């Protein structure tokens, strides 16, 4: 997951 | 439905998507994968709801501010409602634009009562994606923001963002059914209740998202 | 059922009233007439819906923290949720009490889902009613996270003065008070608060002789965490 | 009247  | 927003329009109305995946290097930002699933799904559920979607792709500030602001000099006579989907990197207050940022103030301030009066009592929505770490003029706005102030937002490469994957699937099932607010708790518990984040990182690992509605709503809003 | 909070509890919760009327000299800060009425109004719609009220008036801004977090270490097993009304001088981000300001959230993170136990899945509901800003409304012609399970009810948007009349109380909280004993125990707090939002909207205009606060207008603004539907059945 |  990534974050924004 | 001296409770509800009048429907009676001969159009839904305006819904702009900002899709911002690709930024320049000066920004030192990344390339927001899973992005262009999301816009595709949001195309999709708000064109459902009967919205009169476009979609633009990795915008300058300075864009994202023209179309909004172009978008808020358009007649709105005849629509019941606007919307704003933006999805991007953000921080603080801003969004980023693919060139730096830009307050999210300023691209929803086109949209004040004194200033769009086409939408004057009309239900103005705006949905963001991004992390955040006689009538009154700022009436008839709601905020969708994927997470609450000083946390991040989720983005799963493969499947998109928590919230708009959320958003589109509560929209899809619900959204000719039920008023904004009770959509948007249930993308609350969906958020909160399903997701969790997966990080080889553990300050990236195992992490929760609640998102935030913020309304300045008058009225009760159905998509019929 | 599946999506509302449930409510089958012995009780349905404490409700924490902050009242601030009189303030030290150095704040600067004037009296707050009307806000006993308030006060007085809230404790009545407030009890009509179930909750068991207890007010606190002109508290410094130790007491409030001492108040709300010694609310948090009570044990809410058996309640349904939540709730505490702040009456005060405010700017943006803080409240104040007698002797200065506290940041509003630092008061509610002692009900956080981490810290607060017995209210982890209950709606926890904080009314705000002081300015949050300088500005003002001209109008125009007519596991789980920590913060879920929150809703702020402001009775102004961000930057922006909130109204008082001396002899009537505030608006919001006149309009939150008339909302709630006409359909409290009938419409989900997001109805209600919708409807709160239009009559203070519509149904108040400042009265001033001095010109510069003379006819203006007022919204508030509700920030919702929640994640299921709130019924004061 | 006053504002908070
Ligand atoms: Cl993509
Ligand atoms: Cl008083």
């Keep these: 997951d990534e974050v924004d | 439905a001296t409770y509800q927003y009048n429907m009676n329009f001969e159009k839904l109305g305006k819904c702009i998507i900002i899709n911002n995946k690709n930024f ?35 915008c300058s500030c300075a864009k994202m501010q023209d179309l ?17 989907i933006l999805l991007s990197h953000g921080e603080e207050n801003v ?13 929803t301030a086109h949209f004040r009562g004194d200033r769009c009066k ?7 929505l705006f949905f963001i994606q991004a992390c955040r770490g006689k009538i009154p003029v700022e009436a008839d706005f709601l905020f969708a923001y994927s997470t609450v102030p000083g946390y991040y937002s989720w983005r799963s490469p493969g499947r998109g963002s928590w919230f708009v ?17 009770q959509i948007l708790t249930r993308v609350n518990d969906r958020v909160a209740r399903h997701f969790e984040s997966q990080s080889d990182d553990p300050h990236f690992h195992e992490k929760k ?6 309304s300045m709503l008058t009225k009760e809003l159905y998509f019929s």
Excluded: W
């Design chain 2, 24 to 58: 320049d290097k000066v920004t030192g930002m990344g390339v927001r994968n899973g992005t262009d699933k999301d816009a595709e799904a949001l195309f999709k559920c708000f064109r459902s709801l009967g919205f009169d979607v476009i979609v633009y792709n990795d």
């Design chain 2, 68 to 84: 909004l602001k172009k978008a808020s000099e358009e007649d709105h006579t005849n629509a019941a409602c606007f919307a704003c």
């Design chain 2, 95 to 107: 969004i980023y634009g693919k060139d730096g940022v830009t307050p999210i103030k300023d691209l």
């Design chain 2, 118 to 124: 086409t939408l004057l009592e009309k239900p103005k």
């Design chain 2, 165 to 181: 994957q959320a958003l589109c699937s509560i929209l899809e099932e619900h959204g000719k059914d039920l008023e904004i607010m």
């Design chain 2, 209 to 214: 998202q609640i998102p935030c509605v913020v």
